Coordinates of C-alpha atoms in Angstrom, one line a residue:
Chain A
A1 CA -4.3 8.8 29.9
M2 CA -6.7 7.4 27.8
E3 CA -6.4 7.2 23.9
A4 CA -9.2 8.3 21.6
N5 CA -11.0 4.7 21.1
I6 CA -14.8 3.8 20.2
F7 CA -15.9 1.9 22.6
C8 CA -18.4 -0.9 20.7
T9 CA -20.6 -3.3 22.9
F10 CA -22.6 -6.0 22.2
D11 CA -26.5 -6.2 22.5
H12 CA -26.3 -10.3 22.2
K13 CA -24.7 -12.9 24.8
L14 CA -21.5 -13.7 23.8
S15 CA -19.6 -16.7 25.0
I16 CA -16.1 -18.0 25.5
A17 CA -15.8 -20.4 22.6
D18 CA -17.0 -16.4 20.2
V19 CA -14.7 -14.7 22.6
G20 CA -11.7 -16.7 21.4
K21 CA -12.8 -16.9 17.9
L22 CA -12.5 -12.4 18.2
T23 CA -9.1 -12.5 20.1
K24 CA -7.8 -13.7 16.9
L25 CA -8.4 -10.4 15.0
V26 CA -6.6 -8.4 17.4
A27 CA -4.8 -5.7 14.8
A28 CA -8.1 -6.3 12.3
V29 CA -9.3 -3.7 10.3
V30 CA -12.9 -3.2 10.8
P31 CA -14.9 0.1 8.7
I32 CA -17.6 1.6 10.5
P33 CA -19.9 3.7 8.7
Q34 CA -20.2 7.6 11.5
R35 CA -17.2 7.7 14.0
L36 CA -19.5 8.1 17.1
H37 CA -17.8 7.4 20.6
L38 CA -20.2 4.6 21.2
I39 CA -21.3 2.0 18.7
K40 CA -23.9 -1.0 18.3
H41 CA -22.9 -4.4 17.6
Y42 CA -24.5 -3.9 14.2
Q43 CA -21.9 -1.3 13.3
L44 CA -19.3 -3.9 13.0
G45 CA -18.4 -4.5 9.1
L46 CA -20.4 -5.0 5.6
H47 CA -23.4 -6.5 6.7
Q48 CA -25.7 -3.8 7.4
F49 CA -25.0 -3.6 3.4
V50 CA -25.5 -7.1 2.3
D51 CA -28.4 -7.0 -0.3
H52 CA -29.8 -9.6 -3.4
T53 CA -30.6 -7.1 -6.1
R54 CA -27.1 -5.0 -5.4
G55 CA -24.0 -6.4 -5.8
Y56 CA -20.0 -5.5 -5.3
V57 CA -19.8 -2.0 -7.2
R58 CA -22.6 -0.8 -4.9
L59 CA -20.1 -2.0 -1.6
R60 CA -17.1 -0.3 -3.6
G61 CA -19.1 3.2 -3.4
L62 CA -19.3 2.6 0.5
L63 CA -16.3 1.5 1.6
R64 CA -14.4 4.3 0.0
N65 CA -16.1 6.3 1.9
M66 CA -16.5 4.2 5.2
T67 CA -14.5 5.7 8.2
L68 CA -12.5 2.9 8.7
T69 CA -10.8 1.4 12.3
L70 CA -8.7 -0.7 14.1
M71 CA -9.4 -2.8 16.8
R72 CA -7.2 -2.5 19.4
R73 CA -8.6 -4.7 22.7
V74 CA -11.2 -7.1 23.4
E75 CA -13.2 -7.9 26.8
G76 CA -16.0 -8.4 28.1
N77 CA -19.6 -6.2 27.2
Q78 CA -17.2 -3.8 24.9
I79 CA -14.3 -3.7 22.1
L80 CA -11.3 -1.0 22.4
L81 CA -11.1 0.5 17.9
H82 CA -8.9 2.7 17.3
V83 CA -9.1 5.3 15.2
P84 CA -5.8 5.9 13.1
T85 CA -4.0 8.9 12.3
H86 CA -1.9 10.4 9.0
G87 CA 0.8 10.0 9.3
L88 CA 1.1 7.1 12.1
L89 CA 2.8 3.4 12.0
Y90 CA 0.2 1.0 12.6
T91 CA 0.2 -3.0 13.2
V92 CA -2.6 -4.6 10.4
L93 CA -3.8 -7.9 10.2
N94 CA -4.0 -9.5 6.8
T95 CA -7.5 -11.7 6.6
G96 CA -6.7 -11.0 2.5
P97 CA -5.9 -14.1 0.5
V98 CA -2.9 -12.9 -0.4
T99 CA 0.3 -12.8 1.7
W100 CA 2.1 -9.0 1.4
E101 CA 5.6 -7.3 0.9
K102 CA 7.6 -4.4 1.6
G103 CA 6.3 -1.2 0.4
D104 CA 3.3 -2.3 -1.0
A105 CA 0.5 -0.2 -1.4
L106 CA -2.0 -1.4 0.1
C107 CA -6.3 -0.4 0.4
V108 CA -9.4 -1.6 1.2
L109 CA -11.9 -3.8 -1.0
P110 CA -14.8 -5.6 0.3
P111 CA -14.9 -8.8 0.3
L112 CA -15.9 -11.3 -3.4
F113 CA -17.8 -13.9 -1.0
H114 CA -21.0 -13.5 0.5
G115 CA -23.2 -14.4 3.2
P116 CA -23.4 -17.8 1.1
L117 CA -20.2 -19.1 2.0
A118 CA -18.9 -22.1 2.9
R119 CA -14.8 -21.7 3.9
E120 CA -15.7 -18.9 6.3
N121 CA -15.3 -19.6 10.0
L122 CA -16.2 -16.0 11.2
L123 CA -18.0 -14.6 14.3
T124 CA -21.8 -15.5 14.1
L125 CA -25.0 -14.7 15.4
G126 CA -28.9 -15.5 15.0
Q127 CA -28.6 -12.9 12.1
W128 CA -25.8 -10.6 12.9
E129 CA -23.0 -12.1 10.5
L130 CA -19.2 -10.3 11.4
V131 CA -17.6 -9.6 7.5
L132 CA -14.5 -7.9 6.8
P133 CA -13.1 -6.9 3.9
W134 CA -9.7 -7.6 1.9
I135 CA -6.5 -5.2 2.3
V136 CA -4.8 -6.7 -0.7
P137 CA -2.0 -4.5 -2.6
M138 CA -2.9 -2.0 -5.2
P139 CA -2.2 -3.4 -8.1
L140 CA -4.2 -7.0 -7.0
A141 CA -6.8 -4.5 -6.8
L142 CA -6.9 -2.1 -10.2
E143 CA -6.6 -5.3 -11.6
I144 CA -9.7 -6.9 -10.1
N145 CA -12.0 -3.7 -10.9
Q146 CA -10.5 -3.6 -14.4
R147 CA -11.2 -7.7 -15.7
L148 CA -14.5 -7.1 -13.6
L149 CA -15.8 -3.9 -15.4
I150 CA -14.3 -5.4 -18.5
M151 CA -16.0 -9.3 -17.8
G152 CA -18.8 -7.1 -16.3
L153 CA -19.5 -5.4 -20.1
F154 CA -20.4 -8.6 -21.5
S155 CA -23.6 -9.4 -19.6
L156 CA -25.2 -9.4 -22.6
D157 CA -24.9 -11.7 -24.6
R158 CA -23.6 -15.1 -23.1
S159 CA -25.1 -17.3 -25.8
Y160 CA -21.9 -17.1 -28.0
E161 CA -19.2 -19.8 -27.2
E162 CA -16.3 -17.0 -27.9
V163 CA -17.5 -15.1 -25.1
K164 CA -17.9 -17.7 -22.9
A165 CA -14.5 -18.8 -23.5
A166 CA -13.5 -15.0 -23.1
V167 CA -15.1 -14.6 -19.5
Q168 CA -14.7 -18.5 -18.2
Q169 CA -10.4 -17.2 -19.5
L170 CA -11.2 -14.0 -17.9
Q171 CA -12.8 -15.0 -14.2
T172 CA -9.9 -15.9 -13.1
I173 CA -6.6 -13.4 -11.5
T174 CA -3.2 -14.7 -11.7
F175 CA -0.7 -12.9 -8.6
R176 CA 1.9 -14.6 -6.4
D177 CA 0.9 -17.6 -6.1
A178 CA -2.9 -17.0 -6.6
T179 CA -4.8 -18.6 -8.6
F180 CA -7.9 -17.0 -6.7
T181 CA -10.6 -16.4 -9.2
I182 CA -13.3 -13.7 -9.1
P183 CA -17.7 -15.2 -9.8
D184 CA -19.6 -13.8 -12.4
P185 CA -21.5 -10.5 -11.8
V186 CA -24.3 -12.2 -14.3
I187 CA -26.3 -14.2 -11.7
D188 CA -29.0 -16.0 -14.0
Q189 CA -28.6 -13.8 -16.7
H190 CA -30.4 -10.3 -14.8
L191 CA -27.6 -8.3 -14.1
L192 CA -27.0 -6.0 -10.3
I193 CA -28.1 -2.8 -11.5
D194 CA -25.2 -1.1 -10.9
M195 CA -22.9 -2.1 -12.2
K196 CA -25.1 -1.8 -15.8
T197 CA -25.3 1.9 -14.9
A198 CA -21.4 2.0 -13.9
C199 CA -20.6 0.2 -17.8
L200 CA -23.3 1.8 -18.9
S201 CA -21.8 5.0 -18.3
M202 CA -18.7 4.3 -19.6
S203 CA -20.1 3.5 -23.0
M204 CA -21.7 6.4 -22.8
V205 CA -18.6 9.0 -22.0
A206 CA -16.7 7.1 -25.0
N207 CA -19.4 7.2 -26.9
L208 CA -20.5 11.1 -26.5
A209 CA -16.6 11.6 -26.8
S210 CA -16.0 9.6 -29.6
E211 CA -19.3 11.6 -32.0
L212 CA -19.5 15.5 -30.4
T213 CA -14.6 16.4 -30.9
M214 CA -14.9 16.2 -34.4
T215 CA -17.8 19.6 -34.8
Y216 CA -15.8 21.2 -31.6
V217 CA -12.1 21.0 -33.4
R218 CA -14.7 21.9 -36.5
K219 CA -15.3 24.6 -34.4
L220 CA -11.5 25.2 -32.8
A221 CA -9.8 25.0 -35.9
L222 CA -9.4 28.7 -36.0
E223 CA -7.2 29.7 -33.5
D224 CA -4.5 27.5 -34.1
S225 CA -1.2 28.9 -32.1
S226 CA -0.2 25.7 -30.8
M227 CA 0.8 22.1 -32.8
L228 CA -0.7 19.9 -31.0
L229 CA -5.1 20.6 -32.7
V230 CA -3.8 19.5 -36.1
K231 CA -3.2 16.2 -34.9
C232 CA -5.3 16.2 -33.0
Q233 CA -7.8 16.6 -36.0
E234 CA -5.6 14.3 -38.0
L235 CA -6.4 11.6 -35.7
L236 CA -10.2 12.6 -36.3
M237 CA -10.2 12.2 -40.5
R238 CA -8.1 9.6 -39.5
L239 CA -10.5 7.6 -37.8
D240 CA -13.2 6.8 -40.6
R241 CA -10.5 5.7 -43.5
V242 CA -26.1 20.7 -34.6
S243 CA -29.0 22.0 -32.3
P244 CA -27.5 24.5 -29.5
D245 CA -29.9 22.6 -27.3
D246 CA -28.7 19.0 -28.0
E247 CA -25.3 19.5 -27.9
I248 CA -25.4 21.7 -24.6
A249 CA -27.0 18.8 -22.8
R250 CA -24.8 16.1 -25.0
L251 CA -22.1 18.1 -22.9
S252 CA -23.2 18.2 -19.1
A253 CA -24.6 15.0 -20.0
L254 CA -20.2 14.0 -21.1
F255 CA -19.2 16.1 -17.5
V256 CA -22.0 14.4 -15.2
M257 CA -21.7 10.6 -17.0
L258 CA -18.2 11.2 -15.9
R259 CA -18.1 12.3 -12.7
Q260 CA -20.1 9.4 -11.6
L261 CA -17.1 7.3 -12.6
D262 CA -14.2 9.1 -9.8
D263 CA -14.8 5.3 -7.6
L264 CA -13.7 3.3 -10.7
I265 CA -11.5 5.8 -12.6
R266 CA -9.7 6.5 -9.1
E267 CA -9.5 5.1 -5.8
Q268 CA -6.9 6.2 -2.9
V269 CA -4.3 3.8 -1.1
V270 CA -5.3 3.4 2.8
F271 CA -2.1 1.6 4.1
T272 CA 1.6 1.0 3.0
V273 CA 3.9 -1.4 4.4
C274 CA 7.0 -0.9 6.9
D275 CA 7.9 -4.5 7.1
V276 CA 6.0 -8.1 7.2
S277 CA 6.5 -10.4 10.7
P278 CA 7.2 -13.1 10.0
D279 CA 4.6 -15.8 8.6
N280 CA 3.2 -13.5 7.0
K281 CA 0.1 -12.9 8.6
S282 CA 0.7 -10.0 10.1
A283 CA 2.2 -6.3 9.3
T284 CA 2.8 -3.0 11.0
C285 CA 1.5 -0.6 7.9
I286 CA 2.0 2.7 8.5
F287 CA -1.6 4.7 7.3
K288 CA -1.6 7.3 4.3
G289 CA -5.4 8.7 4.3
Chain B
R1 CA 19.7 -16.0 24.0
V2 CA 23.2 -15.4 23.0
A3 CA 24.0 -11.4 21.6
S4 CA 25.4 -12.0 18.0
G5 CA 27.4 -8.7 15.6
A6 CA 24.6 -6.7 14.1
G7 CA 23.2 -7.5 11.0
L8 CA 23.6 -11.1 11.6
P9 CA 20.3 -13.2 12.3
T10 CA 19.7 -12.7 16.1
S11 CA 17.1 -14.6 17.9
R12 CA 13.4 -13.3 18.5
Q13 CA 12.9 -13.6 22.9
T14 CA 11.2 -17.2 23.0
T15 CA 9.1 -19.0 25.4
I16 CA 7.2 -22.1 25.0
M17 CA 4.7 -24.3 27.1
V18 CA 4.6 -28.5 27.9
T19 CA 2.0 -30.2 29.6
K20 CA 2.7 -34.0 30.3
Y21 CA -0.3 -36.2 31.3
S22 CA -0.7 -39.5 33.7
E23 CA -1.2 -42.9 31.9
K24 CA -4.2 -45.3 34.2
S25 CA -2.1 -48.5 34.8
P26 CA -4.7 -50.9 37.3
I27 CA -3.5 -54.4 38.5
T28 CA -4.9 -56.6 40.0
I29 CA -4.5 -60.3 41.9
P30 CA -7.7 -62.9 42.7
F31 CA -7.9 -65.3 44.6
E32 CA -9.8 -68.2 46.1
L33 CA -10.8 -69.6 49.6
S34 CA -12.0 -72.7 49.9
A35 CA -15.7 -74.2 50.9
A36 CA -14.3 -76.8 54.0
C37 CA -12.6 -73.7 55.4
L38 CA -15.1 -70.6 55.0
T39 CA -17.7 -73.3 56.7
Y40 CA -14.9 -73.8 60.0
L41 CA -14.2 -70.4 60.1
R42 CA -17.5 -68.2 60.2
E43 CA -19.9 -70.8 61.3
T44 CA -19.1 -72.2 65.0
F45 CA -18.6 -76.2 66.0
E46 CA -19.3 -78.1 69.3
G47 CA -16.2 -77.9 71.7
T48 CA -13.7 -80.8 70.0
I49 CA -9.6 -80.9 70.2
Chain C
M1 CA -13.7 13.2 37.3
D2 CA -12.0 15.7 40.1
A3 CA -10.9 19.5 38.5
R4 CA -7.3 18.6 39.3
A5 CA -7.1 14.9 37.0
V6 CA -9.4 16.7 34.3
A7 CA -7.8 19.8 33.3
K8 CA -4.8 18.6 34.0
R9 CA -1.7 20.2 31.4
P10 CA -0.3 17.5 28.8
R11 CA 3.2 16.3 29.3
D12 CA 6.2 16.4 27.9
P13 CA 7.0 12.8 27.0
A14 CA 10.5 12.9 28.5
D15 CA 9.4 14.6 31.5
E16 CA 8.2 11.8 33.3
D17 CA 10.6 8.7 34.4
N18 CA 10.6 5.7 32.3
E19 CA 8.2 2.9 31.9
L20 CA 11.4 0.3 31.9
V21 CA 13.0 2.2 34.7
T22 CA 9.9 2.8 37.0
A23 CA 9.0 -0.7 36.3
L24 CA 12.6 -2.1 37.3
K25 CA 12.4 0.3 40.7
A26 CA 8.9 -0.9 42.2
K27 CA 10.7 -3.9 42.9
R28 CA 14.7 -2.4 43.7
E29 CA 16.2 -4.6 41.7
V30 CA 20.0 -3.8 39.9
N31 CA 21.0 -5.6 36.3
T32 CA 24.4 -3.7 34.5
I33 CA 21.9 -2.6 31.6
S34 CA 21.7 1.1 32.3
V35 CA 18.0 2.3 32.2
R36 CA 17.7 6.0 32.9
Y37 CA 18.4 7.3 29.5
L38 CA 16.5 5.3 26.4
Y39 CA 17.9 6.4 23.2
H40 CA 15.5 6.6 20.4
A41 CA 13.2 7.9 22.2
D42 CA 11.5 11.0 21.3
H43 CA 12.0 10.4 17.6
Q44 CA 9.5 11.4 15.4
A45 CA 10.8 9.8 12.2
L46 CA 9.8 6.2 11.5
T47 CA 12.9 3.6 11.3
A48 CA 12.3 0.9 8.7
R49 CA 14.8 -2.2 9.0
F50 CA 15.5 -3.5 5.3
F51 CA 17.9 -6.1 4.2
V52 CA 19.5 -5.4 0.3
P53 CA 22.6 -7.4 -1.2
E54 CA 26.0 -6.3 -1.3
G55 CA 26.1 -5.5 -5.4
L56 CA 23.1 -2.7 -4.7
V57 CA 24.9 -1.0 -2.2
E58 CA 27.8 1.2 -3.1
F59 CA 27.3 5.0 -3.7
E60 CA 25.2 4.2 -0.2
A61 CA 27.9 3.8 2.4
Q62 CA 27.6 8.3 2.5
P63 CA 24.2 9.2 4.3
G64 CA 21.2 10.4 2.5
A65 CA 20.4 9.0 -0.7
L66 CA 16.6 7.7 -2.1
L67 CA 15.2 4.0 -1.8
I68 CA 13.2 2.8 -5.4
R69 CA 12.2 -0.8 -5.2
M70 CA 10.9 -2.6 -8.4
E71 CA 8.9 -5.4 -9.1
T72 CA 9.9 -8.2 -11.6
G73 CA 8.0 -11.8 -12.9
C74 CA 10.2 -14.0 -11.5
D75 CA 9.2 -14.9 -7.9
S76 CA 12.0 -15.3 -5.0
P77 CA 14.0 -12.1 -5.8
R78 CA 10.8 -10.3 -6.9
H79 CA 11.4 -6.5 -5.7
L80 CA 15.0 -5.6 -5.7
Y81 CA 16.0 -2.3 -4.0
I82 CA 17.6 0.0 -6.5
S83 CA 18.8 3.5 -5.2
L84 CA 18.2 6.0 -7.1
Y85 CA 21.7 6.2 -9.0
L86 CA 21.7 3.7 -10.7
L87 CA 18.3 4.2 -11.9
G88 CA 20.6 7.0 -13.5
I89 CA 22.1 4.4 -16.1
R90 CA 19.0 4.2 -18.0
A91 CA 18.0 7.5 -17.8
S92 CA 19.4 8.8 -21.7
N93 CA 19.3 12.7 -19.0
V94 CA 22.5 12.1 -17.6
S95 CA 25.3 13.1 -19.7
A96 CA 27.9 10.1 -21.5
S97 CA 30.9 11.6 -18.8
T98 CA 29.2 10.4 -16.3
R99 CA 26.7 8.0 -17.3
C100 CA 30.5 6.0 -18.7
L101 CA 32.0 7.6 -15.3
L102 CA 29.1 5.3 -13.3
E103 CA 28.6 2.3 -15.6
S104 CA 32.1 1.3 -14.3
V105 CA 31.6 1.4 -10.6
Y106 CA 28.1 -0.6 -10.4
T107 CA 29.9 -3.8 -12.1
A108 CA 28.1 -6.9 -10.2
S109 CA 25.1 -9.4 -10.5
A110 CA 22.3 -8.2 -8.9
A111 CA 23.2 -3.9 -10.4
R112 CA 23.3 -5.4 -14.1
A113 CA 20.1 -7.5 -13.2
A114 CA 18.3 -4.2 -12.3
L115 CA 19.4 -3.0 -16.0
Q116 CA 18.1 -6.1 -17.6
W117 CA 15.1 -5.6 -15.5
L118 CA 14.1 -1.8 -16.7
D119 CA 14.2 -3.5 -20.6
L120 CA 10.3 -4.5 -20.8
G121 CA 7.6 -1.8 -22.1
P122 CA 7.1 1.8 -21.0
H123 CA 3.2 1.9 -19.2
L124 CA 4.8 -1.1 -17.1
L125 CA 7.8 0.4 -16.1
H126 CA 6.0 3.0 -14.5
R127 CA 4.9 0.5 -12.2
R128 CA 7.7 -0.9 -11.4
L129 CA 9.1 1.6 -9.4
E130 CA 7.8 2.6 -6.1
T131 CA 8.7 4.5 -3.6
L132 CA 10.0 3.3 -0.7
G133 CA 12.3 7.3 0.9
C134 CA 15.9 7.7 2.2
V135 CA 18.2 5.9 4.1
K136 CA 20.5 6.8 6.8
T137 CA 22.7 4.4 8.6
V138 CA 24.6 1.5 6.8
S139 CA 26.0 -1.8 8.9
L140 CA 28.2 -2.9 5.5
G141 CA 28.3 -6.5 5.7
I142 CA 28.4 -8.9 2.7
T143 CA 24.0 -7.9 3.6
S144 CA 24.3 -4.9 4.9
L145 CA 20.8 -3.8 7.5
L146 CA 19.7 -0.1 5.9
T147 CA 17.4 2.1 8.4
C148 CA 14.8 3.1 6.3
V149 CA 12.7 6.4 6.6
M150 CA 9.3 7.3 5.4
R151 CA 7.8 9.7 7.6
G152 CA 9.5 12.6 9.2
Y153 CA 13.0 14.7 9.1
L154 CA 16.2 12.5 8.2
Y155 CA 18.9 12.6 11.1
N156 CA 21.6 10.7 13.0
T157 CA 21.0 9.5 16.5
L158 CA 20.7 11.5 19.7
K159 CA 20.0 14.1 17.0
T160 CA 23.9 15.8 16.8
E161 CA 23.8 15.6 12.1
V162 CA 20.9 16.2 10.6
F163 CA 21.4 14.3 6.9
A164 CA 20.6 15.6 3.0
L165 CA 19.6 14.5 0.8
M166 CA 21.6 13.6 -2.3
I167 CA 20.9 14.0 -5.7
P168 CA 23.3 14.2 -8.9
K169 CA 23.6 17.4 -10.8
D170 CA 22.0 16.0 -14.3
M171 CA 18.6 15.4 -12.8
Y172 CA 18.2 18.6 -10.7
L173 CA 15.8 20.5 -12.4
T174 CA 14.7 23.8 -11.1
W175 CA 11.8 26.2 -13.2
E176 CA 12.4 29.4 -12.0
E177 CA 15.4 32.0 -11.0
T178 CA 14.3 33.1 -7.9
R179 CA 13.5 30.4 -5.4
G180 CA 10.1 30.7 -2.3
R181 CA 10.0 30.6 0.6
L182 CA 9.5 26.9 1.1
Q183 CA 9.8 24.1 -2.1
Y184 CA 8.6 20.6 -2.0
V185 CA 10.1 17.7 -4.1
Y186 CA 9.2 16.0 -7.1
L187 CA 10.4 12.8 -8.7
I188 CA 9.6 13.2 -12.3
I189 CA 9.6 11.3 -14.5
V190 CA 9.6 11.7 -18.9
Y191 CA 9.7 9.2 -21.6
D192 CA 10.4 10.7 -24.9
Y193 CA 8.3 8.8 -26.9
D194 CA 10.8 8.6 -30.5
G195 CA 10.0 5.8 -33.0
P196 CA 12.2 2.6 -32.5
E197 CA 13.8 3.8 -28.7
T198 CA 11.7 4.3 -25.7
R199 CA 14.1 4.9 -23.2
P200 CA 13.2 7.4 -20.6
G201 CA 14.7 10.1 -18.6
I202 CA 14.8 10.6 -14.7
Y203 CA 14.1 14.7 -12.9
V204 CA 13.9 16.0 -9.8
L205 CA 11.4 19.3 -9.5
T206 CA 12.0 21.5 -6.1
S207 CA 9.2 22.9 -7.3
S208 CA 8.1 26.2 -4.7
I209 CA 3.9 25.0 -6.7
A210 CA 1.6 23.3 -3.8
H211 CA -1.4 22.6 -5.7
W212 CA -1.0 20.1 -8.4
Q213 CA -3.0 21.1 -11.3
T214 CA -0.8 24.1 -10.9
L215 CA 2.3 22.3 -11.2
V216 CA 0.9 20.2 -14.4
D217 CA 0.0 23.1 -16.1
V218 CA 3.7 23.8 -16.2
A219 CA 5.0 19.8 -16.5
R220 CA 2.9 20.7 -19.9
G221 CA 5.0 24.0 -20.8
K222 CA 8.2 22.5 -19.8
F223 CA 7.3 19.0 -21.4
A224 CA 5.9 19.9 -24.8
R225 CA 8.4 18.5 -27.1
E226 CA 8.1 14.5 -24.6
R227 CA 3.2 15.0 -24.8
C228 CA 4.5 15.5 -28.7
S229 CA 6.9 12.7 -29.6
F230 CA 3.6 10.3 -27.6
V231 CA 1.2 11.5 -30.1
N232 CA 3.7 11.3 -32.9
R233 CA 3.9 7.8 -31.4
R234 CA 0.2 7.5 -31.2
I235 CA -0.1 8.2 -34.4
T236 CA 2.9 6.6 -36.8
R237 CA 2.0 3.1 -35.0
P238 CA -1.5 2.5 -34.3
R239 CA -3.7 -0.4 -33.3
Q240 CA -0.5 0.1 -30.4
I241 CA -0.8 1.1 -26.5
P242 CA 1.3 3.9 -25.2
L243 CA 0.0 5.8 -21.7
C244 CA 1.5 7.9 -19.2
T245 CA 3.6 9.4 -20.6
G246 CA 4.7 11.9 -17.8
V247 CA 5.0 10.6 -14.7
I248 CA 5.3 12.4 -10.7
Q249 CA 4.9 12.1 -7.4
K250 CA 5.9 14.2 -3.9
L251 CA 9.1 13.7 -2.0
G252 CA 9.3 16.0 0.8
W253 CA 10.7 19.5 0.9
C254 CA 13.5 21.2 2.1
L255 CA 13.4 24.8 4.0
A256 CA 15.1 26.0 0.3
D257 CA 17.6 27.8 1.8
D258 CA 20.0 24.7 2.3
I259 CA 20.8 23.8 -1.8
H260 CA 24.0 24.3 -2.9
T261 CA 26.8 21.4 -5.0
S262 CA 28.9 19.0 -3.1
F263 CA 31.1 16.1 -4.2
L264 CA 30.4 12.2 -3.3
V265 CA 33.6 10.0 -2.8
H266 CA 33.1 6.4 -2.7
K267 CA 36.0 4.2 -4.9
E268 CA 37.8 7.3 -5.4
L269 CA 34.8 8.9 -8.1
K270 CA 33.6 11.9 -7.6
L271 CA 30.1 12.4 -8.2
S272 CA 28.9 16.3 -7.8
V273 CA 25.5 16.7 -6.5
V274 CA 23.7 18.9 -4.6
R275 CA 22.9 18.8 -0.9
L276 CA 19.6 19.6 0.8
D277 CA 20.6 19.5 3.9
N278 CA 17.5 19.8 6.3
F279 CA 15.9 17.7 4.1
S280 CA 11.6 15.9 5.9
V281 CA 10.7 13.0 3.3
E282 CA 7.1 13.1 3.3
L283 CA 5.6 10.7 0.3
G284 CA 2.5 10.9 -1.8
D285 CA 1.3 8.9 -4.4
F286 CA 2.7 8.6 -8.2
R287 CA 0.2 10.2 -10.7
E288 CA 0.7 11.6 -13.6
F289 CA 0.1 13.4 -17.0
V290 CA -1.3 13.2 -20.6

């Protein structure tokens, strides 16, 4: 009997050096749009979604619901991808920048370097270019998403010197043997649209929460049976030291601007490490999805 | 490999590949052959002792 | 493609001969290695072998206890495999009788180094701990070699003995009078945010409630002093940054009928614990509640 795999063909001609480059990635993480059983080679990675006017956060949105998989065997005309299941252990290659340890929570993350890159030696075709999302530990993914959101929140006033100091000292991350730096979301003083939507919704839920809760605890101060509401509005009286249709639209806007932030305020851990092989390029991670 | 007790560092299953090569080293000893002896060898003269 | 090969019945994974057996049998050789019955074959549990120094393996030679790693700002000994009982010495939940009992038995370097590495802020003290699972076997050397389990049950080899989970008496916490048919176990961390001090409490919750919002409802019902201390700390010291006042995560599930009180014997110190005999470890991500 065989195993429930995904066959993958290659429409372009393959050479022996390209297959020899491909067989380095035996147990590598690969994303897939929908789990069919015969896919073309234009659906192996994120190069179908690499775009100019859209950037990182759109790729994070597409990756969080992408159905990832693992390669199993490379041969002529067919690439056997294995769909991992919840609750089995799988060898996974470390194509990322950082070594892992025993017990790190591991999650997918798109590559920070685009198509224009000097350091990549990957599977390259006439137009098609295989890319591969790294798997970093979840503290690094939280730190990268958080620092990128903060230095994208200053995408409007880069004229000043102190904000240039803030971004250029926020352009880098500090991890285990990692002087790794992340590139700027601002490119030539115009911002990619979805990053703008993310920080706009952040400031919008902040301003809505800081404006309407005082009126609502004014309306709530008559049902006081628990010891929480009085200090809840003591906070609001400490900070300073209406038509119904507008507040209805304000509250619906509050919940929808929150609901558009689920990709940023949470994300699920994908793999987790059972052990690390010597020389730290492989690990046998139990899937958790 | 040699087996040791439990917990001690054991040995991974190990193979190896070694390829030798071959060196070039041609030799030569040239020599000359005299013109009088060659004209007496390759050409035939008259009947003299 | 035929009807005998497409609609074939699914096999029993121990019924056919082993791959090593048929591989030796196709050439018909003899080797002193016995081959006919492989051990650890039909183990649904997932084994994991982890190194540990000798300074943390006391009260661990008994089979069955938790295993929690911490992060440290240093580079080379960066991760340290604390057991469950050693997390209680910093915990202000257990009584001073039991804390001055087991404080006098962890006299080592790395144990007190771990206690000194729970010294920093609480919001990062959430981030330092991540659950590694349970442990069944030891080896009792200078560097003893554990066999960690992460998913599935917890048993001795050849399935002849089911191993249990050991949790100490003051961490044990039931939020009901009548148990259900099943109950999942949990790891509840709370922070009594008082004025000067910030030293937390560790709990294990054997609740029968499945859905997580219906568990944080009972958690907010039974930890009102902790959230009140959290908001007292938020008012009394502004311009600071407190967060994650109560932390919860899954640890598995028992069968809700094998829970009774037993005792530990190690260095002639009796530690009263409750057990969970037919236990399976099934972990989850670290959630929280405010």
